């Protein structure tokens, strides 16, 4: 069937959220026409990658609502509310970024060997170099700053908001934190992100973080501190 501007923009965004790997589902039925009728082109996967790449990295000044640099009102810097109705993310253009706040994860990963270590890590005593915690007792909220996003952080009964210089979105599903994936001659994710946990929400009563605690060892080899890591839990909820 036909879709108006309103319904088609939601599915258009729904496809972007799927390609960014923030969603695992989509409603794109009718979208292909919608791009022929309202945009006069064929919006295959190649087209959508070019829109993601150009919006987040290779900007060209002013962008419109469909991530091109109807839909003749081109904006400036800031954010599109990529909202499919089913899900949404506040994503920022690369024109509003000073440098490249993304890292290239197809490039080789520094070796990190596993080691014995504390199974429980206290939120006030986090010696991991990949995680930095801020406790806001006044606001009853916790902000976890992830410094090495390539090391997974897994949520367990958590209702969090992910904040970054790329996209901002909510996470409510157990498992590894989903991050935006952009393709620019390789795979790119944000260089840092922030997990915001509101302890005033009953849904976070048992919020626990599972991650690899990365540690700089005493040994310096090849002019670098050797890295070791151990699996650990950071309990954040009251009754965790």
């Amino acid at each position, epitope marked *: 069937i036909i879709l108006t501007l309103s319904q088609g923009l939601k599915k258009y965004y729904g496809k972007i959220l799927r390609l960014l790997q923030l969603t695992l589902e989509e409603d794109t039925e009718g979208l292909l026409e919608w791009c022929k009728r309202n945009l006069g082109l064929d919006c295959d996967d190649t087209f959508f990658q070019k829109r993601i790449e150009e919006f987040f990295i290779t900007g060209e000044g002013h962008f419109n609502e469909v991530l091109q640099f109807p839909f003749k009102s081109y904006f400036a810097k800031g954010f599109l509310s990529i909202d499919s109705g089913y899900y949404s993310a506040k994503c920022y253009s690369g024109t509003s970024n000073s440098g490249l706040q993304l890292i290239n994860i197809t490039r080789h990963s520094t070796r990190i060997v596993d*080691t014995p270590g*504390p199974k429980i890590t206290n939120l006030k005593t986090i010696n991991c170099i990949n995680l930095k915690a801020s406790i806001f007792k006044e606001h009853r909220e916790v902000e976890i700053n992830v410094l090495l996003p390539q090391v997974a952080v897994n949520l367990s009964n958590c209702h969090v908001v992910i904040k970054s210089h790329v996209c901002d979105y909510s996470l409510d599903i157990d498992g590894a934190v989903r991050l935006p994936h952009i393709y620019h001659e390789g795979v790119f994710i944000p260089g840092t992100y922030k997990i915001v946990i509101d302890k005033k929400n009953k849904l976070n009563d048992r919020c626990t973080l599972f991650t690899d*605690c990365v540690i*700089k*060892g*005493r040994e310096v080899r090849k002019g670098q501190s050797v890295l*070791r890591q151990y699996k650990t839990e950071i309990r954040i909820g009251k009754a965790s």
Partner: antibody, heavy 123, light 109 residues
């Protein structure tokens, strides 16, 4: 220097509990970068890790033996200990205590070893 | 239950180079340590973290680790090098210490 010394009964009866103690000397067992482990070696066989314990009490066991071994640590006496429940002749072995890196700062190799104490299970 | 695979034995003439392998799946991703054990004695750490030597270990000992095999190499072998050699890793998946079965090195006599 830091020296480890096993202390054992030499002889244990079948279906009884073997108890070994390692005395740490020349330094404190309350080391934040190391934990304390038991390794055994039956006659003619290779090395087998039993378990390791951190001064705070956290234990790490070999899965094959977790159901019948336990480790403790006594920070006041500067020793840790090992208990092996319901022993048979399969537990006749040289028992070693050793120190290994823990928590990422030091290498997890077992650098300092005891002398080994010999335990025979017999009626 | 991560499995380490060592050859049962290896012979070498005095002055030649001995090599003792330790096989494991993606063992290059782990830190491999080597212990030397002479008859009736506690084991002694000779190589740690694939290729580092504790103080007092002669330069003739050297280690490497990549892919599925780690290797202990002893150059200019002397009679006193005759011993059992064990490889060892911490297995992060099984949360356990794993020792190889040991390799009996004999020096021709």
């Amino acid at each position: 220097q830091l020296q480890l010394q096993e202390s054992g009964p030499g002889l244990e009866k079948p279906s009884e509990t073997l108890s070994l103690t390692c005395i740490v000397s020349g330094g404190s067992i309350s080391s934040s970068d190391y934990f304390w482990g038991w390794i055994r070696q039956p006659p003619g066989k290779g090395l087998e890790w039993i378990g390791s314990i951190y001064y705070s009490g956290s234990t790490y066991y070999n899965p094959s033996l977790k159901s019948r071994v336990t480790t403790s640590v006594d920070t006041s006496k500067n020793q840790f200990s090992l208990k092996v429940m319901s022993v048979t002749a399969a537990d006749t072995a040289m028992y070693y205590c050793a120190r290994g890196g823990y928590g990422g700062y030091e290498s997890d190799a077992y650098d300092i070893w005891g002398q080994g104490t010999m335990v025979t299970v017999s009626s | 239950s991560y499995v380490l695979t060592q050859p049962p034995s290896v012979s070498v003439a005095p002055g030649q180079t001995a090599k003792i392998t330790c096989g494991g799946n993606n063992i290059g991703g782990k830190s491999v340590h080597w212990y030397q054990q002479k008859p009736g004695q506690a084991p002694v750490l000779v190589v740690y973290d694939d290729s580092d030597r504790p103080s007092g270990i002669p330069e003739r000992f050297s280690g490497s680790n990549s892919g599925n095999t780690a290797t202990l190499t002893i150059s200019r072998v002397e009679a006193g090098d005759e011993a059992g050699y064990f490889c060892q890793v911490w297995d992060g998946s099984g949360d356990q210490v794993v020792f190889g079965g040991g390799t009996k090195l004999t020096v021709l006599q």
